[PDB]
Amino acid sequence: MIQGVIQKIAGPAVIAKGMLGARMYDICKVGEEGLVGEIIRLDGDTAFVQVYEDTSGLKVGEPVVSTGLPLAVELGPGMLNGIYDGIQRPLERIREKTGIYITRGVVVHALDREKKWAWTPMVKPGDEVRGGMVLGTVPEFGFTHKILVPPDVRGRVKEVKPAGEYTVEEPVVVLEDGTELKMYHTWPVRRARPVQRKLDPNTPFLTGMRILDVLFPVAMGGTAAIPGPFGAGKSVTQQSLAKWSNADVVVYVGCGERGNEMTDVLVEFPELTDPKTGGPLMHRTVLIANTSNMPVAAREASIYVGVTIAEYFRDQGFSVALMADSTSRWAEALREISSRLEEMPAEEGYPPYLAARLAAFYERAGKVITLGGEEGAVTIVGAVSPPGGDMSEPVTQSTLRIVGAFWRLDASLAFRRHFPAINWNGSYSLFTSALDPWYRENVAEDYPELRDAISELLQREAGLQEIVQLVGPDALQDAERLVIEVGRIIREDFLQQNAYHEVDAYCSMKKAYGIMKMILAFYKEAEAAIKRGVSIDEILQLPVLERIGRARYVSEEEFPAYFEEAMKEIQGAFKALA
Amino acid sequence: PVQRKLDPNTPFLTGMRILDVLFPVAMGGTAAIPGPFGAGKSVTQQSLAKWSNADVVVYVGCGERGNEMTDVLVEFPELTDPKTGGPLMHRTVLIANTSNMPVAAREASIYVGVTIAEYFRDQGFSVALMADSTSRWAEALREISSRLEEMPAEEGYPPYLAARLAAFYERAGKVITLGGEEGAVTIVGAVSP
Amino acid sequence: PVQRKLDPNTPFLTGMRILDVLFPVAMGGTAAIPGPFGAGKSVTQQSLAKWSNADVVVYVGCGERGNEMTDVLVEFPELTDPKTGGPLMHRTVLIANTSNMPVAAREASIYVGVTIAEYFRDQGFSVALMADSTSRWAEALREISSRLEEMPAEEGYPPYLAARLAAFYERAGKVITLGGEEGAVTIVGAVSP
Amino acid sequence: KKEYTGITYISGPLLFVENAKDLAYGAIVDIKDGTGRVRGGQVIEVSEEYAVIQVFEETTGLDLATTSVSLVEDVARLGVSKEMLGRRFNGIGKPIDGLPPITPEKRLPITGLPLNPVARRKPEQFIQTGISTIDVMNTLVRGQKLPIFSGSGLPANEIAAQIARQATVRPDLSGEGEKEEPFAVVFAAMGITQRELSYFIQEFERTGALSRSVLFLNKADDPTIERILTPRMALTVAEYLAFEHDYHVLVILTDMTNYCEALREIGAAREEIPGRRGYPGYMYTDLATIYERAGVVEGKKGSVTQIPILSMPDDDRTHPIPDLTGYITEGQIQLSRELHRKGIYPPIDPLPSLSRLMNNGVGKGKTREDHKQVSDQLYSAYANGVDIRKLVAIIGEDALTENDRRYLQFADAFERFFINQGQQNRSIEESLQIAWALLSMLPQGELKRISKDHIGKYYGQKLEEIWGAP
Amino acid sequence: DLLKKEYTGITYISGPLLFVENAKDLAYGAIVDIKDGTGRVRGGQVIEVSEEYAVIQVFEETTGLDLATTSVSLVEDVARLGVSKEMLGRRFNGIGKPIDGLPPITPEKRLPITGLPLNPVARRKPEQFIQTGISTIDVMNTLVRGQKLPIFSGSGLPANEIAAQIARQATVRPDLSGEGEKEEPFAVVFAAMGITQRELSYFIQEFERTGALSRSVLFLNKADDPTIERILTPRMALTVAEYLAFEHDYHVLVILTDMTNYCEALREIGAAREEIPGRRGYPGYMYTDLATIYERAGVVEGKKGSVTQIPILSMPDDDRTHPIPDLTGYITEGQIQLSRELHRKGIYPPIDPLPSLSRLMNNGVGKGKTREDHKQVSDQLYSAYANGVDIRKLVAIIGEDALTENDRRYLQFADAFERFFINQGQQNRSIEESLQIAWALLSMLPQGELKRISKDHIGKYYGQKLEEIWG
Amino acid sequence: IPGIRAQIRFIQQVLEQREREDTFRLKRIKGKIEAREAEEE
Ligand SMILES: Nc1ncnc2c1ncn2[C@@H]1O[C@H](COP(=O)(O)OP(=O)(O)OP(=O)(O)O)[C@@H](O)[C@H]1O
Ligand SMILES: Nc1ncnc2c1ncn2[C@@H]1O[C@H](COP(=O)(O)OP(=O)(O)OP(=O)(O)O)[C@@H](O)[C@H]1O
Ligand SMILES: [Mg+2]
């Protein structure tokens, strides 16, 4: 195979000579330790290699071999309830071999080769086969893992194995041409897994958070971005999405972030429950951890590994949520490598291709009909980390032009310990109009109008706040004061939400609808009272306000009775005055 | 070349009382007008063309929009010279450039205009030069500078912008030609920030 | 070299109430006095050199006016030492590299001044070092780095400016001398943002 | 034909090829790899020692030992035909609707030539978009460039689709006129997402607008060079139709912000020092070469009109893209976030909107006689109303005089019934009727900017005429 | 291994960089000795290797180096530090050589200074509450054992005093947690990067007063010391700290005095190397480099030791948007940000709680750890202080006469907060005292405004007046 | 209003300075690569 030697070592970058014939974006083994790398430039006989591990100690003259194939992921049973590195190495196995530290050059299989899986064949001899069709099933943590033909494989089936207990290395099915199909196949990460056809997003992605799921929703096949400065709550929001989202599988990609967050997920999620199937929450989760102090070149690989795993679970008919912990660190890694390549930068050091890469990543989302004819989806929720909190960075601006929802976080709110800490004025969604039928069917026939009424009230508050700053709250009339006060009620009792509570950490759609109805009814009553001359100061003391404010913490099961009583009490609190 | 430059001791009768009285310009002077939308800049410039005491009028649109350029190229033929009642264009040279013409032409527009004005001045005449949107010309200069990879000054303009502007404007003045006659070039430029 | 460094526990008396009361400096301390032009940096430092309680003063004019050095030379010979009662110049060392003198000599002036101050400290005196403009030393570094073609940090200054300033200021301190006597160097540094 | 195999360098989007002095500058090339896959590229530099190709799409499988380059075309050309109508392409002209490829009447270089200034003429006739706030207050005149400035979450795509489906000429309002004057719409989308693509396909298919439109859709995951080429091909087709078959083409360029970002990326890929704010120093000239392919020509019955739709990067008018677009174009239709959040669609704020050509396309013999004055009165009245709305929050409704209260109610009704027309297609007559109904609320004599005869003839109509069926 | 290979043939010396041509046998990252003509030996590290030459970053000044008599020799391929438990009580310099006159230490292991990533699977979740004795940290910005909680200081702000006080007062509360009651102290590793003599004198005097120099390792790079030696100092310190913690079951507290100086050294090297900068000239890899240091703290499953970091950095112009604080905050697990406004008013420790943060706080507070009302009390304190600041801004434009009664109560709360909770001087406040003060202050507000505190907690702790504590 | 105008002018000046420094750096590096190609290819 193509063999050469090292010419030059500068950080994660290795220049290899004697590599004529090496292909672009091929995996190569640098040095005697077989460090995995990727060819990013061909120059004469030379080849530029970015090494996915550390390079300290490497000398000039050590061998460099090209595998001949690009970065690939092993897809098959054995992935859920597991944590992987950026290039899909099981970290549990690495701890078993290494100690508490991650050492370089560990060769470990992505999927367990000894575990035995029960196989129920779905095909018989003489059956036609196409890529993506289902060859059988294999139970996995309460899921029915579907064995799928590789997307570019066809033919007829020679002999299917009888139902039994085998491993992923055994040819469960073999075709006429001699192709030996196993429980797992490999796929290049940088290639979008083919699908039959895309579908218009028309169902919501429930996140459990009121503000996101009500005012700034995201569809199942949708994409969202959550930018903010450090200390605003991106990680808490994304962990809440992992815990409480209505997806089937969750892929969490820790791209260049704190290792304590991955540790937190690993330690805590086994003690929690899956919202739908009721089992442990780690059974529906995959973790890709490439922390900040790990090799920088693998930050790029983490995103592709995560998206490919998500597309695989989508091809199995599931609905998947992909949580990219930081795309900003991916961009920073690209900038580092570009500096090693001595290229012309663009904007603040970023290479010209950053936006194309980001678009290619985000366009891999969506709701599809799989090649096998099921319906699966992938929802991407990426986080951006602008320097200084500035939203005019190239990464944040590029994300703005591709995502369907923008959850802008705010430093002023987080400083006040007001969470989720979402800036309402600078946030938006594009899936609201398309999700009206679903809301009418599954929440309430007038949910769209209540949501729009709250949007109207918040915009009225935003308009009046200019005058508030100019002259102060007392200078306003009574109706404007009521607009301000209802705005505060919405901020504190509806948009505010506590993630460390045993009740308010999750909110259903009907609970949000009930709270919104309570607020709208109160606003109408109070406006009428002001029209009949009641003093505004006397409205703020109506006891019903404490019930409206405490509704958040009511349990989900108890909520309907509380809400019926609250509507009765709202009618009473003004009816008595007459 | 000219034999001598003379002092500005004679007026440039624009025909408009406000300009000719409150803020007058001398023969061989220099003026500036901003162009805001709806301000009548077009009518004022056409009136300078019609009623000024200049024998020739050179009009330069360095980087105008296509529609403004067609407006000016459709209106000027329709005007009538008050002095003779013949077409005003018989004593006018029009230099027309649109935004999509080569940047070299848009930079050279004002120089072509000022050279032609100097030629008619040397023939013993009094010529009025009206350069519309010298800001677009400055934009052409800035693009050319970027193509040369020059270090800008201020809002990306090259550090020699003022030098070029002075070179263009100081070519105005009342003079005694090499033929011994008297002629002048009066420049009215427009700035559109 | 020195035997050991000590904790500043004696005031550096400047004769100016605001500095001596609200913002004191110890005898081996460091002070910076930035200000725009016309604020009183030079007058403040001259007053420090005239009335302070240092045995020796080393005044260093880097990239500043020559009239100031001329003023010092003309005036101090007819002024009295605060403590010893003799002429003021007899306790002053003047290092002058004015604005229009060679630029790279500013660095040498700073280093020469600090070294002479250290010498007199090693003789057991209390020495005040007045740097008239450290900004001009930074400018000299910037020019020399431009001739080296080094990649610049903020505002074109070389990325080691902070290190050089730190090394210069860290020569201040009250110390036990190699001969066992007690000495101090107090550096007041003017900055011209 | 002739294959070049001296590939000496591959890095990012560039590959160097030696002994290629026969490749013209800007020629389109094909790249075959070891697996036989064919990529595409463009010659970006030709020298006596090597040529530089810019590769569309990625450069994954390429190797220096099994890569060959062949010439496709010396000049990027587009095969245009009248059969293009009813078809959707991909930004380099390839069909993406599944239909057979067209047989061209001719092939034209996408980089058209500048129009001769002395061949132009004054725009003097209007296009009826069906939207009241544009038709009445910021009219559109054939040959104009009237961009839409929008924001991040605003519905610019929906407005684009609505104008695409509703835009028509009105030959009957211009004297007797000609009943048959062909009209076409060219819709150029740059860097759109899959959901937006599906939306556009559905919108064009449902109402039958496809039959009179040509679509050039470039996705955000498509190559950037295709994004740069898309507007040029759109305008090539538009010029062909207008100036060879007397069509009245309306061109919509969906996202010029995407085009500008792609332009900056391409410039940085060729080692160009960027200009102001990091954008190319020639962005002005490039935008001009796009925007100035519209107008009306002497002796030709056709015209080209442009509606470039750009998203204000951070709701900032001082940004390069909108500032330069303002230099080149004539006015702007400004979308307001306050109206959008208040629930008003289409959220066009008349106050910062301006149509620079409205005068020449409005008046007698084109529309109605009362159009200019009605627009002026609407503008002034709405401004007064917004002012009173701000003041009443501090002084109170009682403190206001009676005329001020009239202005308040007028502004509310204007927002509710004029701006907020939903998806309805309003003819100019219906819009003017609504305008007069809104103006009837103010007393006669406060209509200081409308002639007496117009007020007499059209004043008094109650709001019940349109309130019954809003 | 046992032989000395010497590389004459140096072709370049400029600033911090040295080029040596035929050095094809030098490993990337190796450590070398540079011997000049006079015999002085200077260090350096290989940061680029090729068949042409090797780039060496020098750790000292280049005065006296010539291209004829200068030579380069190898010390080791990977930079390792000799590590022994007997390093406690010793003072080392930036490159880890003794400066106290005692003999060089006999290593038990030679560990690489860069270290290795800690496996996320191996990590343990930090949950032990550390009582610092400072109310703003203890109640509202709780510090746990195994956390990276830096201090964001200014030019003249007293961050060093706060660090000394935290080291002096730190302790766990075994009684409140239910675990074994042990009184083992902290082992303090102290890394000074470009420290002035004034600050170093203060720190040394304070530690000597407290008798902590016996259980402390000091790595001192002063202001007169070479600038490029600062790249190694934090890594040496963290190597020692990790060794002690995860091989000898120590609870290590690491103080990194000035990370701004470290970042400046990084910028010097990167500028010499023509690295594409990020913002304000700092290298594009500064985030990764800072994470290689900060992320070396935590706790590991199945071991009793820990590492806790308290980095101190000075915000250049009190700018939180500057790259150094920005990246640090993106990496660390919170920050304690000082305020110059409170400093001018005389408040010590001048800690502004609104910009401060502690990520891991929720893991070390609550029932069974400190007390049940802790979290809600901190949330309510933030709410009330934010209201007070807003009302101050309102008064700045409208005047006190227009303030309603509730607004005046909030202003009075803000002033009392600043004067009695934030301002404590040098006093060790138990978490119970701090909670008591917080409660006495919250009692200045009507019962109903405490929306973040549960009704039962309000019943159990509301009402006590501030006079019962003082006066 | 004048104070906010002064603040705006200051911020705009700082941003222009940062842009100028970036352009200077880009010119340096482009010249570096060009000189590399011209001299040592
Ligand atoms: N001297 C004048 N006498 C009468 N009417 C005038 C006079 N000057 C201007 N006007 C009127 O005012 C209008 C001025 O606005 P208009 O839009 O026409 O200006 P413009 O000169 O074309 O502007 P710009 O050059 O900035 O594009 C003229 O069209 C005409 O209606
Ligand atoms: N303490 C003072 N008493 C009286 N006049 C003073 C005092 N300080 C400054 N001045 C006046 O201010 C003038 C300028 O002061 P000075 O020369 O010290 O400025 P500077 O801050 O050093 O500025 P520059 O950078 O221009 O040299 C002095 O000539 C004197 O007129
Ligand atoms: Mg001075």
Side-chain angles (χ1 to χ4, degrees), chain C residues 38 40-43 64-65 68 132 192:
Chain C
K41 290 183 307 303
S42 308
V43 170
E64 282 304 333
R65 308 180 182 84
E68 295 175 351
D132 203 346
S192 310

Side-chain angles (χ1 to χ4, degrees), chain E residues 6 34 41 51 80 89 92 172 179 197 206 220 226 242 278 295 297 305 319-320 327 336 340 357 397 419 427 455 458:
Chain E
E6 195 80 33
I34 309 162
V41 177
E51 307 169 295
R80 324 196 165 78
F92 309 95
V172 292
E179 287 104 15
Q197 181 57 40
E206 185 64 16
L220 300 183
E242 263 171 358
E295 278 289 358
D319 206 291
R320 197 176 145 130
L327 301 182
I336 297 121
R340 204 176 285 282
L357 173 80
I397 303 164
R419 286 205 313 293
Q427 287 182 334
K455 274 308 107 173
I458 274 162

Side-chain angles (χ1 to χ4, degrees), chain A residues 30 46 400:
Chain A
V30 187
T46 59
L400 283 167

